[PDB]
Amino acid sequence: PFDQMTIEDLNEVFPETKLDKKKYPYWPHRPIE
Amino acid sequence: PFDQMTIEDLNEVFPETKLDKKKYPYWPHRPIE
Amino acid sequence: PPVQVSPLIKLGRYSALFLGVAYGAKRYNYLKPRAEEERRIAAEEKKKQDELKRIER
Amino acid sequence: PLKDRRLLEVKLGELPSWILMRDFTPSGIAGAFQRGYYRYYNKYVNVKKGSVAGLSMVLAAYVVFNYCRSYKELKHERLRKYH
Amino acid sequence: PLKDRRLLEVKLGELPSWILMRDFTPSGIAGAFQRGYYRYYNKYVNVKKGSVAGLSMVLAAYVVFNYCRSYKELKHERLRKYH
Amino acid sequence: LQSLIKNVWIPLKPYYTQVYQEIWVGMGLMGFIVYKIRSADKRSKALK
Amino acid sequence: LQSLIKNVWIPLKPYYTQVYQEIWVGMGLMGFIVYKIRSADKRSKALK
Amino acid sequence: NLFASFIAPTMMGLPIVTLIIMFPSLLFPTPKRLINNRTISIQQWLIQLTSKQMMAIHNQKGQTWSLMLMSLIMFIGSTNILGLLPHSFTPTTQLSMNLGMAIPLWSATVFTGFRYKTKTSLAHFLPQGTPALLIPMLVIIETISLFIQPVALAVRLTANITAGHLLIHLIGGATLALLNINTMTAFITFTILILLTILEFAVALIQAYVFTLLVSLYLHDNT
Amino acid sequence: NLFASFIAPTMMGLPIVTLIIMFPSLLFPTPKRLINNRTISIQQWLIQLTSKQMMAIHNQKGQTWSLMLMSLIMFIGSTNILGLLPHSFTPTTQLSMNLGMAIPLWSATVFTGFRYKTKTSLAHFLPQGTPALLIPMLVIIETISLFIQPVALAVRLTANITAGHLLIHLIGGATLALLNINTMTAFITFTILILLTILEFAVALIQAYVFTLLVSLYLHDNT
Amino acid sequence: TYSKPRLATFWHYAKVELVPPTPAEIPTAIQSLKKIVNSAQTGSFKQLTVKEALLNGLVATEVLMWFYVGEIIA
Amino acid sequence: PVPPLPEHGGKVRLGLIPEEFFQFLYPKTGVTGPYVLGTGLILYLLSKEIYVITAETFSAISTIGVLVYIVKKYGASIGAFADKLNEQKIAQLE
Amino acid sequence: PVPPLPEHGGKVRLGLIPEEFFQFLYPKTGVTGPYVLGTGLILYLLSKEIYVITAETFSAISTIGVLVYIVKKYGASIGAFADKLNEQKIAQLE
Amino acid sequence: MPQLDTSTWFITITSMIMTLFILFQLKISNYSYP
Amino acid sequence: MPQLDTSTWFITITSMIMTLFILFQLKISNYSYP
């Protein structure tokens, strides 16, 4: 389900939700659009 | 020899030097004659 | 059996010596007047305290 | 050829290597105070002709201890002000 | 059937048995504070409808803490002398 | 604490039980008195 | 300390090196000033 | 008689006051599941919101300090609330803490402004094309009212906070004292106290925003 | 100005003074070999000697306290010497320690005397066959000068010790002060100081013997 | 008294160790200093063992005390 | 790979003290033991002046009144607010 | 089953400080480095008044004079005394 | 003004630092995005 | 008279006890007979 999962589980199911660490090494790892 | 030995080593060599613990349970484990 | 000095140190020593001699003379000169005056003005103050307890015994 | 060595043996570069290979738990504090006491003891005391120096050291140490303890109350009577 | 049990399970006669079967090293102190925090957390907080009581307790605890801290300076204005 | 007890309760047992029964009472009296006096001075300075 | 470093030096590294180079200098200045002021008051009360 | 609450506490001869400061750290736990309970979802939303709001203007380089600013504001907004309680301590009103929290940031901003953009940072001392009659009488003012930044940046917060605690103590004392006399005055002052309490609940966050906003735009300038 | 040396020390806000007291414990190590070095053989002989001397009179039951008495005297003879050094602390001059070391022993002796030998211990209040004219005026005196035991038993030692430290401090101070004036007076007072120092080396053990002898015979009576 | 024997024993080592430096070895000393600077700048002296650095620092402080000595003269 | 949660944890009385206390005490006095117990604890603290009364008392009273007002008026609103955010993330992803 | 002892352990200079120090220092200054080292350490302590002088100074001086007198006059007497006790136990048993 | 009895400044400052630049930079560094 | 600032009596007493009735009764309890 959803509640039984974590952020890494979303890395697992949706790689497009990935907050990549190269183009945005800092927090929140992406801009504020 | 002597210097290489201990009080228990004297218990070993001379049982008559034994400070028995029954008739004199306390310190110096014998009277002051 | 003495061991000859490594020259590095024979150099480093007497230089610092005379540096410190100069430092000491400079400190003496620079410091004398300030203490002289602070103490003399404290003497004014203590004479004033004396006359105070003279009139306010 | 060894990970742990006498802190004098180890170098400055691997200094932290030594600092991190060694332990710090209070048991490992008693197991240090004991080693110090026993080095002193078995080197300057437990010998068949022990001398004054076999004892005078700890006395003149306790002295400096109790002098440091007291430094605060002694800054109030320095004979000269600007030292 | 067990040596170590909940301090409520153990009896008074074997009280010291429990006191001596358990450990005391600071690691075993963190490994206790953690258990307390996590019992509280997983019992009153990490639930889908957490309430005030899931929080108010720690607040009204900190209160009493900082009250005890202050008892000394408050024995100087008791309205009545002989209590 | 096991080393502690095995260093200070094997030898020192026959003393605290058989002989020193009568000094612990005295130490309790000592505690009584010290309590009394600390309380008295605490009282008198709480006044001032 | 290994757990400590692996909790507070994996994530917080890129910050202390790349960004915060300029705040540590400021903290050194802060130390300078606090030293100065504590020394001044220590001096003035050593007088009295 | 009443500066007491600002006296640094140690229940005995030991260093405690470093625990009055890390306590808030755990009224803001961290999540590990994806979904979580309420107390985390709420603060999470709150933070997304406040960031999306304040870090809009800054350029891309200047967008590296989000962590610092929001942590600063969170920490302070906690401390200044918690301090409200009956017998709690405000580790901010210890002026030293405020100085040590102000200076480094201001200095590091200025240093980023003079390490890069040297000529331009120097230039911000002379507003554009002012009358050439008065240049010195202006590049004195700007450069004196620069160094004035951190001092006020701290003292404002410090004394602002302090005053509220002091005022509530005093009003409650006069409340008891009038209760000695009569009844209705006590209720008057109690309602007064309720109003003051709310107003303090408010300033205690207003000042956090002020602080980390001042800083944000000081970075906007000298980035 | 000079009661300082009797002020209880703590280098900081922590309980140190319980280390000034156990330090002697290791100027008297314990042997494990049969033969040993000098510093142990000497003290061993010393102790055999002093026991064989003092514990002669006591009966067989009363010969169970050898440990306590000789430990008492050893501990005190250490402390009161060590305290001589330039900047050392005498944990005895803390009167409380002396009271806590005196009372229990005296009380426990009296209690052994009234648990057994009840009629006879009661009897020691009336010396044998005194004039029957004055009985009360005698069984008041004996019973008041009994309870006076521990008080003096402690205070004597306490103040005896203290006075020496105080006197040496003062003589050395006046030594420096006269040195301001002249030379020979300083040497006069320095020799005086040497004499005093020896005399203190002496009393510091005389009093131990006194103490654990008083106690020994108090046990001799009420055994 | 025994001042003469040990005082001469000390002069023995003094006229060979309390000696000022000569204008001839100044080159050797300055060059050794520059070699120290070399070992320092690159970060190669950081392979030393402790005892050596301890010794170096203790003799450094030795040289240092003479500064306060000069103050004494002052 | 994570576990779920309950619907609501340990129920609580007065919003402050848990009930398990009460039940643990049921066998001996049942119901009206804990309440008088606390009343006595508190009258004791007050009587011997382990808790002297001053301005901070009334400050605490005011803060607490405010707080209870707030909760008793906004609680479930905030609860549904949060559950809404949760379901909203679920959907906006789902 | 026990080990023996040396005849006399680490030799010592001034009866207080060990020599190993001196040798460790031999390579660089050889002989007259440690002495001036200490002289400077001490003149420093004195100059900056890390060690102010008072009555206790002279008390320490007197105690130390006494002690050195005692040892330098009774040392070997006590040493042979103790070795005598040792040999005497050996014999009286042997 | 007890904010001027400078004795305590060192600890206050150091602890402020320890907090403001360690703990929160741990917690908040873990918050997530929509 | 600093022997009357009673604050410290508890610790002094307890430590005296700990010493006089533990350590020496360990050391001296090991001395031997001729």
- In SS3 terms, J38-55 reads as HHHHCCCHHHCEHHHHHH
The experimental technique behind this entry is cryo-EM
> Which of L47, L27, L52, L22 is closest to L37 using CA atoms?
L22
Task: Please tell me whether residue L13 adopts helix, strand or coil conformation.
Answer: strand
Task: Please tell me whether residue I33 adopts helix, strand or coil conformation.
Answer: strand
Parallel, antiparallel, or unpaired: how do β-strands K12-13 and L12-13 relate?
unpaired
From residue I119, give the alpha-carbon distance in Å to each of E43, I115, I122, I148, I149: 69, 10, 5, 22, 21
Of C7, C20, C28, the CB nearest to J67: C20
Q: Is residue I214 less than 8 Å (CB to CB) from chain L?
A: no
Of K5, K59, K86, the CB nearest to H86: K59
Q: Cα(D82)–Cα(I124) distance, rounded to whole angstroms?
A: 71
Q: Do chains G and H touch (3 or more CB pairs under 8 A)?
A: yes
From residue B18, give the alpha-carbon distance in Å to each of F10, H3, I106, L88: 20, 74, 35, 20
The residue type of K33 is G
Q: Kindly list the residues from chain E whose CB atom is less than 8 angstroms away from the CB atom of residue H4.
A: 73
Residue that is written with structure tokens 């050195």 in the block: L68
Residues with Cβ within 8 Å of residue K13, at least 6 apart in sequence: K19, K22
The residue type of I216 is S
Q: Cα(I169)–Cα(I2) distance, rounded to whole angstroms?
A: 8
Question: Min CA distance, G47 vs chain H (Å)?
Answer: 24
Residues with Cβ within 8 Å of residue I212, at least 6 apart in sequence: I54, I69, I70, I72, I73
Hey, what are H22's tokens?
Answer: 């890390």
> Which of C17, N31, L9, C38 is closest to I51 using CA atoms?
N31
Breaks (C-N over 2.5 A) in chain A follow: none
The residue type of N11 is I
Q: Find the domain containing D38 and state its range.
A: 1-83
Q: Kindly list the residues from chain I whose CB atom is less than 8 angstroms away from the CB atom of residue L65.
A: 194
Write the DSSP symbol of residue D1: -
Hey, what are I102's tokens?
Answer: 């005196």
Most distant CA pair in chain N, distance: 48
Q: Please report, in angstroms and rounded to a whole number, the separation of the first and last CA atoms in chain J.
A: 33
Hey, what are H116's tokens?
Answer: 């890069």
Q: Do chains L and D touch (3 or more CB pairs under 8 A)?
A: yes
Report the 10 Å Cβ neighbour count for I37: 21
Across the interface, do C24 and J71 touch by the CB < 8 Å criterion?
yes
The residue type of K46 is L
Report the 10 Å Cβ neighbour count for E4: 11
What's the burial of G8, exposed, middle or buried (CB within 10 Å: 0-12/13-18/19+)?
middle
Q: Do chains B and M touch (3 or more CB pairs under 8 A)?
A: no
Q: Cα(F8)–Cα(F20) distance, rounded to whole angstroms?
A: 15
Report the 10 Å Cβ neighbour count for F19: 16
From residue F47, give the alpha-carbon distance in Å to each of C31, H47, H79: 52, 55, 38
How many domains does chain E contain in total? 1
The CA radius of gyration of chain M, in Å to the nearest whole number, is 15
Q: Are E46 and H37 in contact (CB under 8 A)?
A: yes
* Cα dihedral D68, D74, D78, D82 sign: positive
Q: Find the domain containing H20 and state its range.
A: 1-223
Q: Is the peptide bond before K34 cis (omega within 30 degrees of 0)?
A: no
Strands (E), L1-94: 12-13, 17-18
Hey, what are F37's tokens?
Answer: 């006096």
Degrees to nearest 5, angle at CA I30 with I28 and I36: 100
Q: Kindly list the residues from chain D whose CB atom is less than 8 angstroms away from the CB atom of residue I39.
A: 45, 50, 54-55
Question: Min CA distance, I42 vs chain L (Å)?
Answer: 7
Q: Please report, in angstroms and rounded to a whole number, the separation of the first and last CA atoms in chain F.
A: 46
Alpha carbon E72 to its chain centroid, in Å, reads 23
Region of residue B20 (left: phi > 0; alpha: psi -120 to 50; beta: else): beta
Q: Is residue F22 less than 8 Å (CB to CB) from chain I?
A: yes
How many domains does chain I contain in total? 1
Q: Are E72 and H87 in contact (CB under 8 A)?
A: no
Residue that is written with structure tokens 């006498």 in the block: D6
Task: Please tell me whether residue J34 adopts helix, strand or coil conformation.
Answer: helix
Q: Kindly list the residues from chain K whose CB atom is less than 8 angstroms away from the CB atom of residue H170.
A: 55
**Subunits with at least 3 CB pairs below 8 A relative to chain N?**
B, F, I
Q: Which of residues 9-68 of J touch L (CB under 8 A)?
A: 10, 13-14, 17-18, 51, 55, 58-59, 62, 65-66, 68
Q: Is residue F12 less than 8 Å (CB to CB) from chain I?
A: no
Degrees to nearest 5, angle at CA K50 with K35 and E61: 65
Across the interface, do N20 and I67 touch by the CB < 8 Å criterion?
no
Letter string b/e over residues C18-57, b meaning 16 or more CB atoms within 10 A of that residue's CB: eebbebbeeeeeeeeeeeeeeeeeeeeeeeeeeeeeeeee
Q: Cα(L13)–Cα(I140) distance, rounded to whole angstroms?
A: 66
